[PDB]
Every structure is written in C-alpha cells, then in structure tokens.
Amino acid sequence: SHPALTQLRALRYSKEIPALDPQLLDWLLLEDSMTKRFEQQGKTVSVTMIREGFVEQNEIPEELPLLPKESRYWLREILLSADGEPWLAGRTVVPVSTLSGPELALQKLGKTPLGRYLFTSSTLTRDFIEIGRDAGLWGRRSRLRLSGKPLLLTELFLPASPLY
C-alpha cells in the first residue's frame, strides 16, 4: 500500500514531549492543522489517497483502545505533499457513530484535506496529543471531537518535512 503508512503504524509511544528544541514541539503539539501550517512554509499542499473505507475492529488495533467499541470504523490513509514532495503520512479512524449529521462530510473528503478551515460549521475539541517515534522519525496521535463525537488522528513526519 505505502511504505510511509507502514512506518506510521509502527510508531511507538511513551508520550514524553521531546526535550528537543522548542521549535520541533510547536509542530508536534500544534493545535491548528497541518495543511495551512505547511502552506505558511510557502508551498502547495496536496493529498495522495492511499485507502478509504469501513473496516472492522481487527483492522484498527493501534486505535481501538482509544475509541469506543463499534461494528465498523471509517479508515482513511493519505500522504500530504509540499510542492510535490511527501512531508507527512496520515491515518484517520472514525467510529460510525461519529458520522452522524454534518459529520458525514468526513466520508466525502476525496483529495481534499481534513478539517477546521471549512469546519467553521462545527466545533472541535481536543482530548490530547502524544508524541511517538520509531526508526528515527517523529509521529503524534490525537483524539479529536466534533460536537463530542470522537475520531483518532495519527501523523508521521517525513524526512523532507520542516522538522529534522
């Protein structure tokens, strides 16, 4: 499917916000979303669709403990690019429960990036953000809420990104 997404799922946690210079953290603990942030850096952001669709509990083992137990979840894997080069790998797990009312948009993203700057129709909350890493790269997972309805976001920062 994609080597970056394979790395992403290998991320390992122990939270601990990386003592590394507080300029790497401001990225890793960033609360506004990646896209606009990547754009500020002066570059066209674009989405590469790897796989989107409903999956059962046994296809989301790393996320399951952080979400409620439902019949299926909407899984979306994408790669995010800056002026053509991959800067990040993204994997979203959305309990079917969350896809109620205006949240059915989470299913119609296409090659359009996820949340906020159009999600000025809803109102998000953020339970947390914990840093992870593996094979030398940074990654973070966060549980977001739209009207209280949870979804899990995990990202991996790739070598070409404005972190390392």
Ligand X SMILES: COc1cc(C(=O)[O-])ccc1O
Binding of residue 99 to ligand X (CB under 6 A)? no
* List of E strands, 66-135: 73-82, 85-95, 124-134
How many whole angstroms from its chain centre is CA 58?
Answer: 19
3-state SS assignment for residue 15: coil
From the list 18-26, 65-73, 74-82, 127-135, the region that binds ligand X by CB under 6 A is: 74-82
Binding of residue 63 to ligand X (CB under 6 A)? no
Scanning the chain, the segments in alpha helix (DSSP H) are 3-10, 25-28, 34-40
Binding of residue 132 to ligand X (CB under 6 A)? no
Which position's Cβ is nearest ligand X? 90
We find the least distance from the C-beta atom of residue 74 to ligand X, in angstroms, to be 11
Distances (CA, A) of 115 to 19, 145, 164: 29, 11, 26
We find the least distance from the C-beta atom of residue 78 to ligand X, in angstroms, to be 4
We find the least distance from the C-beta atom of residue 108 to ligand X, in angstroms, to be 11
Residues that bind ligand X (CB under 6 A): 33-35, 47, 76, 78, 80, 90, 92, 109, 113-114, 153, 155
